[PDB]
Amino acid sequence: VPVQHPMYIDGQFVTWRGDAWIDVVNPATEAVISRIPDGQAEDARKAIDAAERAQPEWEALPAIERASWLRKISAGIRERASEISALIVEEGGKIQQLAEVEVAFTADYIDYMAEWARRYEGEIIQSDRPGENILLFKRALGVTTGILPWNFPFFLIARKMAPALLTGNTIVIKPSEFTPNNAIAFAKIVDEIGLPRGVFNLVLGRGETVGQELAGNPKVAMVSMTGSVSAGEKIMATAAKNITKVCLELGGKAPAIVMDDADLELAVKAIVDSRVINSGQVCNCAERVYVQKGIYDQFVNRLGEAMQAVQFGNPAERNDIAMGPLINAAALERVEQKVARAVEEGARVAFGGKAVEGKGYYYPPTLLLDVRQEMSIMHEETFGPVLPVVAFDTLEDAISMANDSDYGLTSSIYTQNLNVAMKAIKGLKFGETYINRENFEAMQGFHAGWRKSGIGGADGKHGLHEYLQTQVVYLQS
Amino acid sequence: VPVQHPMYIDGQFVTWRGDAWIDVVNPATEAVISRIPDGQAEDARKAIDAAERAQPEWEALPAIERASWLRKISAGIRERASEISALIVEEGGKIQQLAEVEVAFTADYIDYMAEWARRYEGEIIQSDRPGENILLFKRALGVTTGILPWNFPFFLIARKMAPALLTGNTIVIKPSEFTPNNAIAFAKIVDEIGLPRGVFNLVLGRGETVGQELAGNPKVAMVSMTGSVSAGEKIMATAAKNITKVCLELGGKAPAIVMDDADLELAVKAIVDSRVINSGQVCNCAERVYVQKGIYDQFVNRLGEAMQAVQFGNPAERNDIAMGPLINAAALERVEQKVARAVEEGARVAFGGKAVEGKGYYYPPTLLLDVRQEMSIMHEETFGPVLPVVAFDTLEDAISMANDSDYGLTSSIYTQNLNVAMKAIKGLKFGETYINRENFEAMQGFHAGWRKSGIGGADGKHGLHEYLQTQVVYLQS
Amino acid sequence: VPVQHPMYIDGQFVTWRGDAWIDVVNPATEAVISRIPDGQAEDARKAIDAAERAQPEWEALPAIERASWLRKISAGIRERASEISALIVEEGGKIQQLAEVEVAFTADYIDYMAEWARRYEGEIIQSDRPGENILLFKRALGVTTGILPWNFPFFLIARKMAPALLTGNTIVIKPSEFTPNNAIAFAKIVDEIGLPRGVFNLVLGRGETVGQELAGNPKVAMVSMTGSVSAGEKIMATAAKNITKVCLELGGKAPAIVMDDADLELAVKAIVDSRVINSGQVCNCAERVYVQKGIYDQFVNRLGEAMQAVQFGNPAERNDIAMGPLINAAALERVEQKVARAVEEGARVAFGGKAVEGKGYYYPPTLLLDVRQEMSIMHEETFGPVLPVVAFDTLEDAISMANDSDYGLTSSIYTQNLNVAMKAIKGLKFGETYINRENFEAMQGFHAGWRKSGIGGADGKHGLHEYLQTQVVYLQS
Amino acid sequence: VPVQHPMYIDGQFVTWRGDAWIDVVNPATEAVISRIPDGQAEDARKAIDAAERAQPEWEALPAIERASWLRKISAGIRERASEISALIVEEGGKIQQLAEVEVAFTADYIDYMAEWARRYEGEIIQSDRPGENILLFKRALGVTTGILPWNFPFFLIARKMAPALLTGNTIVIKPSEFTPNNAIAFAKIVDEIGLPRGVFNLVLGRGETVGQELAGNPKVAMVSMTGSVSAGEKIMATAAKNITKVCLELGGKAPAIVMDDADLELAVKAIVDSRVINSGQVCNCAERVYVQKGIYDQFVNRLGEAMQAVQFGNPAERNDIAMGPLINAAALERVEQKVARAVEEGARVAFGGKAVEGKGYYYPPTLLLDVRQEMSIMHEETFGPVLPVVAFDTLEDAISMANDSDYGLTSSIYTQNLNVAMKAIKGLKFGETYINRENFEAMQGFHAGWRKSGIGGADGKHGLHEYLQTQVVYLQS
């Protein structure tokens, strides 16, 4: 019997007394693995009210004590790593190796954030008035909320709750309805170690109902969400009503520029890895590849072979595959239509391009050639493992085409010339630029997107600061 | 004949070819002093497109050269100080002394911001990968827009354009339709010194038309606006459509806490000054005064006398007055209704409380006693010069009541006890807390409101950073 | 048989082949507990040469990997806590409770410093030249050395080696000849976990021989030493020869100011604790107490009783004592002479003032009254548990007398008035000022002395930076 | 009649009443242009005592007011630019164009430093104790002293006094006995604008007498000096006596690495300019040139021609020369001997190498080829315009040879390969590394030498911080 999950509100699991449930399906087999409540705004309010009641006492605790609580959580996660990884493989459809890395990374990330306890600093500013001290303190926002995507669902729990809790905020999280199981497991760990009630809450439901309440409740100081630009818009519009602060990461269409003087072998490996990450269901990955004439032929051949070797299938029954199924039916179709439109517009299928039919949602790695910068596939977040390629003559062309997008989170370039490198760095309008390596943000970096890719950001010192606000005290004599 | 103003777009003044104009009235006499175009979205787009065309070349200039341009602007302002001050007195209705201070301060502020040129710094972060350098650069957002309030209209031009231009952004500003003259004067200075075309643009019109385009045009990287919470909501909702970043300062209801051990003389002077600033048409000013029992009687008596001496009248014909008229008819009525509701709810008029009838919009300083924390006047931004007073027993009561508000920009407290001070500091949930002095933010501070008072902030290093975004470069080998 | 210790050079313990040894005596019984080599400059050079050979590979390791090595060390220390604490009790003569706290704190300190790995940052500076990037990196100094005092010998090992190793430096440490056993234990832990050879070295001997080579060898980038001003002078003079950087902490004469409006109970407890810390053999402790007239009588009475209860004796056989013996004979005599001079100059013995005669080196807690700011005892680091008291009328007097010293490390004041507090803060010329609490620096603070108390400092971010130097790269195009 | 200069002590010029004077000679003609007193320790003490008396009131002034005083000084300098430049040309022997740039730069530098007034910040640190605030303030050191070199004598006055005064310190400066005239002019400006007495003092004399008192007087918080390593040693040894902080810049032997893939034209121009700067009497300049085989022949030919065009002569009578005379007789001889030793050791004179005989001290630009890394000329600060060249095969060789020096201030490299650049950056052990451009530090950078090149540093934020020390306040409840 598929387990029916409870919500975690005010320090205890609460059994859902509603009649409506939401089935959680294994994207590899389409089987129902669990059910979660079709939560309502009322449920989100209970979690928010509990978070509000606990916040003052939580912020009053010395930062090192909050860090202490965070360390018990990551220790609990490591103890149940394999269990949590299987939950991720099962509901998220990602391969075993990737799931294991996500759990381990999540625990390391939580520990890294806990280390900020004695380090985030306020400032003392010189005043123009004799005998006056201007003291700028860094305070918690209060109650914060997090809306998570189905891509890297476990890690994103930490990416939002760790910085939030460390700085003295309390939080209410809503997992994606497609991947709530790993979040339930995280909540169990929180319950087991005995985190003060109300500090961490987990509400389950749809974005339309629960999600909106998390963004529009007047007691929320900040709503943090990762997902599509479309959903980001809805969240910011809702937050507008109460001047609620937002932190959004809305994905992108990561450009990869391969120059003629590039280490061909290295570039092909980096691009293939980035793109085929989590079947490409990620944003990080290169989704737009620009190769200049001089190395085109060679590059496209190796890339074509590299991708043909990529095997796809059920993550739970095969550990020798580099790709699992897409998240759900809608995702699969969107990819089909986008490849079809691409082909109808002139794109040349050099590999794949035909959705598999049967149990699960699979799309073979696809390589589209003779694509033009104008083609819609170059201006629409894809989803699946599809790699469009465009040739160019000058660096200026490549940079200009990379910047021709409403997204501005990640970018990459491969070259060995000093001026080219510094030119790409200065010219690319992105939150991140990887040079001669694959795309994967460091926990001490700052993952923040330009243009429609987001507002605010995550990770590192700057990510931690998204959860702090200033109080400037003018102390006279 | 009342002058008809042109807009300043792409380095030149452009004559309005529309049939509709908006009269600009002297709030002291109700006479039409000038007319501005009833600009449309089309006009805002032309300014934005010009700003976009000029931004790359502008950001490419070394920061010290941009600072150089800013210094010519402030030098131009000082040269025309008296002329600009009279424009402010005439349209804003503020007293001569205040107008002169605003112009001088604006010039000093611009110079202070220009000094950041060689000082805003990016960072170099240690990587976990051998031979890798993580470089975090600080880049311009691109095209930014500013929507100004009628309160301190001249200064707010600089508060937004100086930080914006210094960091390499270009800008399009829309003055309040009630106070555009001082903005036209600022534009003339910009034209005279020859600032590169497109860097600074001035569009005129209503919030409904021009303002909305400045917040919803996809080419805008950030919209900065100062005004009412109501208007802030409209702006954030519009920005939501394109995930446009916002910087909002929406005023407040500044609480002042007077303890028994307070320097009575100092406190009364600070509160009266803060409140009667610009006839109280400002947000900074204390709008909620909490006095504890032990010193109540004394405090209320002195405050009552201090306010009775405040004279009001035409700023242009009297330089011996501490107060001018309110901005317009709507403002006057809103104050009347709020005082009437206050009285009907139980408030006790100890002074004033009766709107003057005749040419201009005047409201005498008013003191309301026996007010309860519940009374709507304690939860509604007032406008005019009205001071509600509430008694209390403990510091805990005072702090709790100060925090009982949807606004969280400024606060103040007067005491001589070390623990009380540190307790108020830790307990008050505001962006600013003044201790034993009047409310007036320093240019090197950070004016940023909590809760509904805003998003982001202005002034100092942090204010400058609102106009910067990061680019993290992962340079491998 | 008293064990004869080997030195730890280039990743292995090396047996001393000299004929001269130095006896290490238990200050409580005068019994020889161990022997260490009378090392020579030659020995220090071997350690330095090994440190030099290992430094490039050590700095080349990602910072997180160095932090990883530091964590194995602290984990090793916790595993042998009681063993190490007894070594400290036995040779240092400090009470069991204090020794246990020192070991635990040392392990926590090492962990805290390891956390800086991904956080110390370089900077990116705006240039005046078009297309130029100014990159300021933070690099290791290279080979560093540490000369430790006999007071808190175990902790000081970490205070110098943790920051040094984390930032990529290698180090050579020389323990005080009076307390080398705990250092040998630390070296065993380093050997057991397998820290790369040459990174941590331990050389044994006298300051005249080994110490001087550690300060004057041209391969040393920085010498860090904690001890007396006299020894600090010798070290800086030696370093002068090769322009070697120095980091010195030379103790002090910590002033404590008790106002009339002070929490009498709290103040007496804080002062007694601070002073009687490690029998007063520490610098931190208040060594100059200024009490104003109004509260004098009361304060002196309670302080007198509080000190009379302090029991002294053998730390190893009594766990109900607050004080152990002084480090050695010379220390005991210096205290006697200073109290005698004090008495001969006019000081009034209100308690103690008579050195005990017999096995060990004990001096009873002593209270000297009617002391004048001029008396030499107010301008000479004492050593033992002696508390001189001086009365005063105004805060200005107290501050002026507190600043009348060649030392400027720590200070303290007790009051409840806001202005007094801010006045003391602005007026006291010290590296630290404690208000209404006892003197004990936090690991995230910055323990750095003014005037003759030192050069540079330790702990926190600034302490970590003492081990880093900048490399400014001007990258054109 | 050669003017006899007075000292500037305690806000007024003081006429020297001694019998001994020191002649100041024009290095181009050997004529006596002026005389200064042969000051004694007594004179230095009077200046120091006056600085001490003025410091408290000076530090008590708001920082912006100190910056205001600094701006009057730079404004005064610009007003007398040509007059001051001629003084520099006359006594320093540098060409007119260089002197004019030094004066203008000095005024800009002073203004840049004044801008730090409202920007240097203290910090607020999270505590482990409930209710405690850890406040770290940045305070002035107190009285500081500056010992200036004869190279860039005017600028170095500002490099030390501007940061010192801005942060609240007072200062006593001793110009080089070879170039005191420009310092007298600076003092006149200070007197004319009316800087508070005691804040800026100028004492004249020899290093042996006046210089030593400035480094060894117990009231000096920090001595800052720029000169030779030999003199730096004497200063640090003297400072050691009172644990006085030091800030030393002792020059170097700047290495220049020219790769085969270097922009030959650019490299030759950069090296020739750097080296021939102020006749090479500067440290900045490349003094060790490493050229790899592949481009050797070409590089050496162009460099040889470039240097042959360099004309030398009297700076005052020729404005078409790139080089003036060396500072004095001793300098000239030291260069002769070093070139002679070089030749005797195997060096090949490709140009120059013969000191001119007659009025003045001239040495023609000299190019030495077939020099070996072992040759003493590669390990001895030269002085004059001599360029030794060494060939190499690998980058590793070049880096290793560049690092083979006791000096570590500046370095440079020319290449177009990305990996080479990043490799040189990581491999070069210097305070500065210039890439594809000439050596000239920016005012916002940080000029600080590694190894024997110095201690501490100058310019930018870090340079400003050399004049600040911390006060950590632990405020409990």
PDB file of C-alpha atoms in Angstrom, chain C residues 60 123 125-129 132 134 136-137 139-140 229 232-233 236-237 239-246 250 425-426 428 430-438 440-442 444-446 450-452 454-455 461-462 469-476, chain D residues 60 123 125-129 132 134 136-137 139-140 229 232-233 236-237 239-246 250 425-426 428 430-438 440-442 444-446 450-452 454-455 461-462 469-476:
ATOM      1  CA  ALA C  60      49.326  24.053  -3.181  1.00  0.00           C
ATOM      2  CA  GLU C 123      39.770  41.399  -3.707  1.00  0.00           C
ATOM      3  CA  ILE C 125      39.693  46.472  -7.437  1.00  0.00           C
ATOM      4  CA  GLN C 126      38.382  48.962 -10.000  1.00  0.00           C
ATOM      5  CA  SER C 127      41.173  50.357 -12.154  1.00  0.00           C
ATOM      6  CA  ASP C 128      41.536  53.799 -13.752  1.00  0.00           C
ATOM      7  CA  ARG C 129      42.852  52.110 -16.906  1.00  0.00           C
ATOM      8  CA  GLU C 132      42.545  46.471 -16.777  1.00  0.00           C
ATOM      9  CA  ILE C 134      43.452  44.740 -10.515  1.00  0.00           C
ATOM     10  CA  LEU C 136      44.567  41.282  -5.037  1.00  0.00           C
ATOM     11  CA  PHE C 137      45.241  37.712  -3.882  1.00  0.00           C
ATOM     12  CA  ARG C 139      48.974  34.261  -0.164  1.00  0.00           C
ATOM     13  CA  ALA C 140      50.835  32.366   2.567  1.00  0.00           C
ATOM     14  CA  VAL C 229      58.239  42.617  26.975  1.00  0.00           C
ATOM     15  CA  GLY C 232      59.847  40.504  22.950  1.00  0.00           C
ATOM     16  CA  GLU C 233      62.505  43.183  22.545  1.00  0.00           C
ATOM     17  CA  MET C 236      62.241  42.016  17.412  1.00  0.00           C
ATOM     18  CA  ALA C 237      65.882  43.135  17.475  1.00  0.00           C
ATOM     19  CA  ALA C 239      64.203  39.805  13.398  1.00  0.00           C
ATOM     20  CA  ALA C 240      65.380  43.285  12.370  1.00  0.00           C
ATOM     21  CA  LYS C 241      68.469  41.746  10.773  1.00  0.00           C
ATOM     22  CA  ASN C 242      66.502  40.114   7.971  1.00  0.00           C
ATOM     23  CA  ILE C 243      63.443  42.367   7.990  1.00  0.00           C
ATOM     24  CA  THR C 244      61.516  39.398   9.361  1.00  0.00           C
ATOM     25  CA  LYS C 245      57.884  40.111  10.219  1.00  0.00           C
ATOM     26  CA  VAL C 246      56.917  39.785  13.886  1.00  0.00           C
ATOM     27  CA  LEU C 250      53.753  40.683  25.556  1.00  0.00           C
ATOM     28  CA  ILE C 425      34.856  52.940  25.416  1.00  0.00           C
ATOM     29  CA  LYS C 426      36.042  56.052  23.580  1.00  0.00           C
ATOM     30  CA  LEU C 428      40.309  53.703  27.091  1.00  0.00           C
ATOM     31  CA  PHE C 430      43.392  49.311  24.902  1.00  0.00           C
ATOM     32  CA  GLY C 431      43.053  46.439  22.461  1.00  0.00           C
ATOM     33  CA  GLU C 432      40.136  45.144  24.528  1.00  0.00           C
ATOM     34  CA  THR C 433      37.566  46.593  26.901  1.00  0.00           C
ATOM     35  CA  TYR C 434      35.228  44.347  28.865  1.00  0.00           C
ATOM     36  CA  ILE C 435      32.052  45.892  30.203  1.00  0.00           C
ATOM     37  CA  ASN C 436      30.150  44.355  33.124  1.00  0.00           C
ATOM     38  CA  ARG C 437      31.736  40.906  32.752  1.00  0.00           C
ATOM     39  CA  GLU C 438      35.054  39.100  33.336  1.00  0.00           C
ATOM     40  CA  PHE C 440      38.239  36.265  28.573  1.00  0.00           C
ATOM     41  CA  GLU C 441      38.728  36.776  24.823  1.00  0.00           C
ATOM     42  CA  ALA C 442      36.487  35.009  22.303  1.00  0.00           C
ATOM     43  CA  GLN C 444      36.178  35.119  16.954  1.00  0.00           C
ATOM     44  CA  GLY C 445      37.510  38.328  18.526  1.00  0.00           C
ATOM     45  CA  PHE C 446      40.956  39.893  18.043  1.00  0.00           C
ATOM     46  CA  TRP C 450      48.451  48.519  22.094  1.00  0.00           C
ATOM     47  CA  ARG C 451      51.798  50.141  22.926  1.00  0.00           C
ATOM     48  CA  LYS C 452      54.261  47.660  24.461  1.00  0.00           C
ATOM     49  CA  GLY C 454      52.454  43.776  21.233  1.00  0.00           C
ATOM     50  CA  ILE C 455      52.552  43.947  17.442  1.00  0.00           C
ATOM     51  CA  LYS C 461      39.583  36.928  11.045  1.00  0.00           C
ATOM     52  CA  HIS C 462      42.271  39.518  11.780  1.00  0.00           C
ATOM     53  CA  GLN C 469      50.246  38.648   2.627  1.00  0.00           C
ATOM     54  CA  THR C 470      48.961  40.244  -0.543  1.00  0.00           C
ATOM     55  CA  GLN C 471      49.887  39.868  -4.187  1.00  0.00           C
ATOM     56  CA  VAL C 472      48.371  42.617  -6.343  1.00  0.00           C
ATOM     57  CA  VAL C 473      48.141  41.606  -9.996  1.00  0.00           C
ATOM     58  CA  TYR C 474      47.625  44.332 -12.618  1.00  0.00           C
ATOM     59  CA  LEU C 475      46.258  42.384 -15.578  1.00  0.00           C
ATOM     60  CA  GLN C 476      46.147  44.551 -18.695  1.00  0.00           C
TER      61      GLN C 476
ATOM     62  CA  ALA D  60      38.311  63.745  18.333  1.00  0.00           C
ATOM     63  CA  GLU D 123      32.897  45.484  12.885  1.00  0.00           C
ATOM     64  CA  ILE D 125      30.815  40.278  15.753  1.00  0.00           C
ATOM     65  CA  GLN D 126      28.375  37.558  16.819  1.00  0.00           C
ATOM     66  CA  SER D 127      29.052  36.375  20.357  1.00  0.00           C
ATOM     67  CA  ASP D 128      28.577  32.927  21.911  1.00  0.00           C
ATOM     68  CA  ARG D 129      27.183  34.611  25.033  1.00  0.00           C
ATOM     69  CA  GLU D 132      26.458  40.186  24.492  1.00  0.00           C
ATOM     70  CA  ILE D 134      31.226  42.265  20.496  1.00  0.00           C
ATOM     71  CA  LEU D 136      35.424  46.048  17.138  1.00  0.00           C
ATOM     72  CA  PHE D 137      36.327  49.715  16.612  1.00  0.00           C
ATOM     73  CA  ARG D 139      41.202  53.692  16.329  1.00  0.00           C
ATOM     74  CA  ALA D 140      44.216  55.885  15.544  1.00  0.00           C
ATOM     75  CA  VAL D 229      67.375  47.503   3.333  1.00  0.00           C
ATOM     76  CA  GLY D 232      65.547  49.603   7.271  1.00  0.00           C
ATOM     77  CA  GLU D 233      67.464  47.203   9.502  1.00  0.00           C
ATOM     78  CA  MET D 236      63.628  48.119  12.998  1.00  0.00           C
ATOM     79  CA  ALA D 237      66.410  47.393  15.498  1.00  0.00           C
ATOM     80  CA  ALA D 239      62.053  50.354  17.167  1.00  0.00           C
ATOM     81  CA  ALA D 240      62.560  46.977  18.867  1.00  0.00           C
ATOM     82  CA  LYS D 241      63.526  48.763  22.082  1.00  0.00           C
ATOM     83  CA  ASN D 242      60.015  50.061  22.698  1.00  0.00           C
ATOM     84  CA  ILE D 243      58.064  47.501  20.679  1.00  0.00           C
ATOM     85  CA  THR D 244      57.306  50.307  18.237  1.00  0.00           C
ATOM     86  CA  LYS D 245      55.356  49.252  15.151  1.00  0.00           C
ATOM     87  CA  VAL D 246      57.142  49.628  11.811  1.00  0.00           C
ATOM     88  CA  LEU D 250      62.970  48.893   1.203  1.00  0.00           C
ATOM     89  CA  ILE D 425      50.562  34.721 -11.149  1.00  0.00           C
ATOM     90  CA  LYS D 426      50.482  31.677  -8.872  1.00  0.00           C
ATOM     91  CA  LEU D 428      55.716  34.607  -8.592  1.00  0.00           C
ATOM     92  CA  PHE D 430      55.970  39.203  -5.070  1.00  0.00           C
ATOM     93  CA  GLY D 431      53.749  41.919  -3.651  1.00  0.00           C
ATOM     94  CA  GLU D 432      52.933  42.986  -7.208  1.00  0.00           C
ATOM     95  CA  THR D 433      52.864  41.375 -10.635  1.00  0.00           C
ATOM     96  CA  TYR D 434      52.293  43.444 -13.760  1.00  0.00           C
ATOM     97  CA  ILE D 435      51.087  41.630 -16.846  1.00  0.00           C
ATOM     98  CA  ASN D 436      51.562  43.081 -20.337  1.00  0.00           C
ATOM     99  CA  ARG D 437      52.086  46.658 -19.122  1.00  0.00           C
ATOM    100  CA  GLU D 438      54.684  48.826 -17.345  1.00  0.00           C
ATOM    101  CA  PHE D 440      53.410  51.778 -11.820  1.00  0.00           C
ATOM    102  CA  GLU D 441      51.242  51.164  -8.740  1.00  0.00           C
ATOM    103  CA  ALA D 442      47.714  52.578  -8.522  1.00  0.00           C
ATOM    104  CA  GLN D 444      43.832  52.212  -4.846  1.00  0.00           C
ATOM    105  CA  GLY D 445      46.207  49.230  -4.939  1.00  0.00           C
ATOM    106  CA  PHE D 446      48.520  48.017  -2.157  1.00  0.00           C
ATOM    107  CA  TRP D 450      57.601  40.404   0.408  1.00  0.00           C
ATOM    108  CA  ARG D 451      60.751  39.179   2.168  1.00  0.00           C
ATOM    109  CA  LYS D 452      63.316  41.968   2.640  1.00  0.00           C
ATOM    110  CA  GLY D 454      59.392  45.502   3.581  1.00  0.00           C
ATOM    111  CA  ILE D 455      56.879  45.183   6.408  1.00  0.00           C
ATOM    112  CA  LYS D 461      42.417  50.525   1.857  1.00  0.00           C
ATOM    113  CA  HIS D 462      45.128  48.265   3.277  1.00  0.00           C
ATOM    114  CA  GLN D 469      44.495  49.583  15.360  1.00  0.00           C
ATOM    115  CA  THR D 470      41.562  47.729  16.846  1.00  0.00           C
ATOM    116  CA  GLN D 471      39.688  48.048  20.112  1.00  0.00           C
ATOM    117  CA  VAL D 472      37.406  45.067  20.753  1.00  0.00           C
ATOM    118  CA  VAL D 473      34.627  45.893  23.205  1.00  0.00           C
ATOM    119  CA  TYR D 474      32.743  43.021  24.869  1.00  0.00           C
ATOM    120  CA  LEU D 475      29.522  44.688  25.998  1.00  0.00           C
ATOM    121  CA  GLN D 476      27.531  42.392  28.277  1.00  0.00           C
TER     122      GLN D 476
END
